[PDB]
Amino acid sequence: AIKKYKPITNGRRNMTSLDFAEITKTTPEKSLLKPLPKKAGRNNQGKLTVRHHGGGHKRQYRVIDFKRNKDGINAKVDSIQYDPNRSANIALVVYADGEKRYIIAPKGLEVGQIVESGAEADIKVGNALPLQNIPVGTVVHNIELKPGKGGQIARSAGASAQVLGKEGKYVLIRLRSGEVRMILSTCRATIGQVGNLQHELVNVGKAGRSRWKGIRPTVRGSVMNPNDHPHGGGEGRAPIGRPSPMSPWGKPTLGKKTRRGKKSSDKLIVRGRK
Amino acid sequence: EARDILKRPVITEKSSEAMAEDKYTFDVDTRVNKTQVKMAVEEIFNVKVASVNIMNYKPKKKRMGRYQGYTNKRRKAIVTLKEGSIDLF
Amino acid sequence: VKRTYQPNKRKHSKVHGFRKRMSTKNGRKVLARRRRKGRKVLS
RNA sequence: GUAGCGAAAGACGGGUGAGAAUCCCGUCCACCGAUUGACUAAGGUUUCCAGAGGAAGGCUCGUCCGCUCUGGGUUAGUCGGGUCCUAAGCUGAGGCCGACAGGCGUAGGCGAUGGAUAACAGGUUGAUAUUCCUGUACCACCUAUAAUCGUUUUAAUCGAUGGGGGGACGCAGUAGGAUAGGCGAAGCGUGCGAUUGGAUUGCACGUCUAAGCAGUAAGGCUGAGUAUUAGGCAAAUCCGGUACUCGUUAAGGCUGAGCUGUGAUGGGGAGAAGACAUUGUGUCUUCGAGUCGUUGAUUUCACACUGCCGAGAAAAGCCUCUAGAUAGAAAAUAGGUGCCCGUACCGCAAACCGACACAGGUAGUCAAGAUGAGAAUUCUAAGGUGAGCGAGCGAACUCUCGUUAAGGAACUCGGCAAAAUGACCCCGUAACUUCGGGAGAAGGGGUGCUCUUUAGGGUUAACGCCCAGAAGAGCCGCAGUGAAUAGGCCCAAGCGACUGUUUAUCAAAAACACAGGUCUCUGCUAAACCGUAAGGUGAUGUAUAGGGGCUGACGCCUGCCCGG
């Protein structure tokens, strides 16, 4: 659930937060952690390439199992946990031999619950299967694009896709964007919807909280000078004195498409939006 | 070696106050260690050494009639033998 | 008030200094120039 | 012979000298005192110490000097660094890309601002000291010493290029438990004033390290033992899942734990003078003089516990267990042995950065008493300094400061500046509100000293020992937070929601950010961006996500036109 803070301060008036009620262990596992130093939007040349990335709170990387290779060995859910690197919560599971891993936490997952991977596995939340062995109509998450690589689609909070059909060696699947697509029948996927559905409802309230999350400010082009932006200049406030709004690097940015033709996926896509 | 790493003794009021004790002060080569120093004085003067302390002195700047320069850097040792004496003057 | 040149031996010898000049072809050229000119110090 | 001689309390005596306001010594006075004090880094690099010197330097002088000459001065197994580990980053054999030059990149290597890591007291010099000397310890290496494992597979131990644990970590707050510091007093030391009085009467004092013997004040502990294995690239007696017995007791089983008592040390020094012929009686060869007792107590136990979201390095050292390894090691003694670099001096400054012996700047640590909530304020210990041109006169004018009758903003673009308010206690306090606030609203009143007490915080044993529960009764003065320091207030319009940021050096704002909206692009080798490319950011992310454009909390809303 979501808690609303009282308006003791003008920076806390209309500011909300999560309860973190579905968290049951507030400490991570020592072995599945790795360092995550900040790049701050700067590449191997040391130059800034993407803007508005900077210095927030320090984080450690939880290593996730997006490829559910452990077949025929059921695992018991040991805990639900917070991940700063991600919108969704994670679930610490323990296999029968004692090997322990993290996965993405689905909506209706519970401690003590059992979860398995493979074609022989049954259609229950948390279980991973190939798309060939999944029945049409049901909702899934953490989908592979290539067999054995690991999940790439439907990983965020409250994300889900649904199977729609079956081609020869492909299956039709509908994505959260409204796009339908063809995915190989050998590509794996997990049953169910991703949790933390309320993550999209938080009001960040104050600028400092964005700064904590690592967002530096953004400054509009219309208040720059001409040498810095196409919209810069004007003796006072000025409108966009061009036919189209433009990026800082001199390109249209309203309505102009940017996907490039002659891609392999152009045929595997049948109906697309956004 | 054993007679070239030791170059000169040092004669000062402080060195003489030390020689009142069993302490003797030498000026040695800049590349050698206190172990070499001990072995050398034992080989030469036929005594037994207890401790040997050592320091490095920097070059001191000097002038002489529109010709300035730097002195030589020097390495000083102080040996503290158990028993024996050395017939210096 | 604060002024330029807050000295630092390490940074001096690291950004200037012989090994740093020799690490690059253009830094090997300033040494050749100072040698040709007759400079008493090269770095 | 003009401007200037760089913020600040000096006076006298004596001395030295050719020569003294300026140098040395002495007395008095004054200044800094959360600092003009004392340490440690960076930086500087002999400016350090003795003599000698007055040509130049010193904003005057000079017998002086951070100036000149001569000669001296820095001592480490334990302090800080290297012979240890890694972060960001830098290089990177093979390799990728590229007109050349060259750029990128894997294992790896380098790299502290972090982790690991053995010494304390006293004495002593003109100049060094945890470094020299004394004493007492601790940590590693090697060799002889012999009671213990006695295939050497195994075994304490060797033991991995092997594994599991640990190291290993945020922010705020709370409560305690010890300890440095600090404190009343008859334990006991000490000398008794000269200007009236008094003589429990003035003032102080009561100690001491590392290491090693005992225990210890509280803290954490699914707390103790059996069975098995898709695993720990192979091994494990160690790690992980599950089924049981005493089960949530915490006894004290267990790891860790501030600290306390004896010895260390009847050694040191000691409020001492009682010890001097001398050491100018300064000092010391000799022999003791207190190690008592209350009050309240920073830092440490540990990010211990509790909560919060923004979810808080790595590797080595280390601890356990290993297939194979070897006889076979150890420890407990005694011997020896412990390399290299730095160490002087200045160091919130006359030695650094600033052209200067510049009113500036320069990371960290310690920091006593009275007053007070306080590191604020005023004074003051300790320590440091009297500041680097002076003597007179007391004009105009300029700067800083104080006070001004009557009036009180009439000044002026403008109440600019100044004045006024100011602490603590009590009483009371509007509109309007997003119900939090506004609000310290406004507006009023009180504060000294003495005796009573009936009695509270109790000092509580109790009125006494301090503030008082604060109630009465008195005293003085123009005035009682008697000094200093410590909010001016109200009414009403705009702009911007707010905190924040901005033109280093004429603009701090209504300009930028902002949290919230909205539009658009992007199905992952994503789009976008850097780059010739290779490779990268985006992102070890995946449409509740990421990039771009406009708007700018919140509330009520957001109309017409698709001809160009």
Author numbering:
A (entry chain C): 2 to 275
B (entry chain R): 2 to 90
C (entry chain 2): 2 to 44
Sentences from the paper on this structure:
A focused refinement of both large subunits resulted in a 2.4 Å and 2.3 Å cryo-EM reconstructed maps, respectively. These maps allowed for the unambiguous assignment of ery within SAuL22m_ery complex structure and for defining the interactions of ery with the rRNA nucleotides at the binding site including the identification of the nucleotides that bind ery via hydrophobic interactions as well as its hydrogen bonds. By inspecting the structural changes that occur upon ery binding to the mutant ribosome we could identify a cascade of movements. At the ery binding site, nucleotide G2505 rotates almost 90°, forms a new base pair with C2610 and is stabilized by another bond with U2506. U746 moves together with H35 by about ~3.0 Å to form a bond with OP1 of C2611. Then, A1614 rotates by about 45o where this rotation is stabilized by a bond between N6 from A789 and OP2 of A1614. Due to such cascade of events uL22 ß hairpin loop shifts to the tunnel wall. Upon ery binding, an additional groove form in SAuL22m_ery structure. Thus, we suggest that the uL22m new groove widens the tunnel in which the nascent protein can pass and bypass ery’s steric blockage.
The NPET, which is lined mostly by the 23S ribosomal RNA (rRNA) chain, initiates near the PTC and transverses through the large ribosomal subunit (LSU). Four ribosomal proteins (rProteins), uL4, uL22, uL23 and uL24, of which the globular regions are located on the ribosome surface, extend to line the tunnel walls. The mutations in uL22 including insertions, deletions and single amino acid substitutions are mostly located on the ß hairpin loop of uL22, which extends from the globular domain of the protein and reaches the tunnel wall. We present here the single particle cryo-EM high resolution structures of the apo and ery bound SAuL22m mutant ribosome, which demonstrates how deletion of R88-A89 in S. aureus ribosomal protein uL22 ß hairpin loop leads to ery resistance although it does not hamper the binding of the antibiotic itself.
